[PDB]
Design a binder for this molecule. Structure first.
Ligand SMILES: CN1CCN(c2ccc(-n3cc(-c4ccncc4OCC4CCNCC4)cn3)cc2)CC1
Length: 308
């Protein structure tokens, strides 16, 4: 009976192809009709799951794939998440071969927005890579997989691989430098079929600079891809970096537009018809954010309203 509780709230669709600790099944939320993605972990096949749940309960942002609902049985943990049908950024880059500087900037400012917010909340992602960024129905990016977060070798900073002490924020800035390179080049700056030769290339920090990269793109890459973590650009300076500001003229908006405090009156009203609470009781219950079916219903109604 591992799916009994889940089936009270969701109608299951197909399992999508994945690789790792979890299966991902598509589904729709019965009450709202909204599509969701459900990450399913078999308990006896645990810390990584608990770290991701704790982080996502505390993080809420326009560029972070939203946690709606956590369910647990003796054999499984279910995480109901924001539906991102546009696929991985990794597959998008390959489909385009490489992105122009302009399209890279569109995508990269969204990554900076999410990561700056994560650091502002006291976390470091630690596994930034294009497989961990999914496009939603509005072609906007959503950061996933917070299982390795703190309070993949090709993207790992030299100090992280070496098992040396490090600051999660500096490791994230390095990984963002690798991401920036892959967006504009369509291939990794450090790559090798042999793990030891890749390890050597990362520690050396030397990479090819293709002819299509602009001088400003090259300079930003130099500021992020510094082997010495103390020489890496800070997240604060990345927000208004000249390359980042080119064609925008305003720093990256990293602050969350998705609140914990403010509730949407229309969604509280819609939700209330399914319950037997007075309005104050209903708002107080939603404000507890237990990530139960109530949390899921409220956030999915907010997603439904946002579509217009
Ligand atoms: C017909 N057409 C097919 C594609 N389809 C769709 C695919 C995926 C998703 N989706 C997945 C997540 C998700 C969230 C958090 N952590 C991991 C996740 O997925 C990991 C997979 C691993 C393999 N590569 C894709 C991403 C959120 N939405 C939503 C919709 C829409 C309908």
């Amino acid at each position: 009976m591992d799916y009994d509780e889940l089936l009270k709230y969701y109608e299951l669709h197909e399992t999508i192809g994945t690789g790792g600790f979890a299966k991902v099944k598509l589904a729709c939320h019965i009450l709202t009709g909204e599509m969701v993605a459900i990450k399913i972990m078999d308990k006896n096949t645990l810390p990584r799951i608990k770290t991701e749940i704790e982080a996502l309960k505390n993080l809420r942002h326009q560029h972070i794939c939203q946690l709606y609902h956590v369910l647990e049985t003796a054999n499984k943990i279910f995480m109901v998440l924001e539906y991102c049908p546009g696929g991985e950024l990794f597959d998008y880059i390959i489909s385009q071969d490489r992105l122009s500087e302009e399209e890279t900037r569109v995508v990269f400012r969204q990554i900076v927005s999410a990561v700056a917010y994560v650091h502002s909340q006291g976390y470091a992602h630690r596994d930034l890579k294009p497989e961990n960024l999914l496009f939603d129905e509005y072609h906007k990016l959503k950061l996933i997989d917070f299982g390795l977060c703190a309070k993949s070798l090709a993207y790992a900073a030299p100090e992280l691989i070496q098992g040396k002490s490090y600051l999660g924020s500096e490791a994230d800035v390095w990984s963002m430098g690798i991401l920036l390179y892959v967006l504009m080049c369509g291939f990794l700056p450090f790559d090798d079929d042999n793990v030891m030769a890749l390890y050597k290339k990362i520690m050396r920090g030397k990479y090819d600079v293709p002819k299509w990269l602009s001088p400003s793109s090259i300079l930003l890459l130099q500021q992020m891809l510094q082997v010495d973590p103390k020489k890496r650009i800070s997240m604060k300076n990345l927000l208004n970096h000249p390359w980042i500001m080119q064609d925008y003229n305003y720093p990256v908006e990293w602050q969350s537009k998705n609140p914990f405090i403010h509730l949407d009156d229309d969604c509280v009203t819609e939700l209330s018809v399914h319950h037997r609470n007075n309005r104050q009781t209903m708002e107080d219950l939603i404000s507890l954010w237990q990530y139960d079916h109530l949390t899921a219903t409220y956030l999915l109604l907010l997603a439904k309203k946002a579509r217009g």
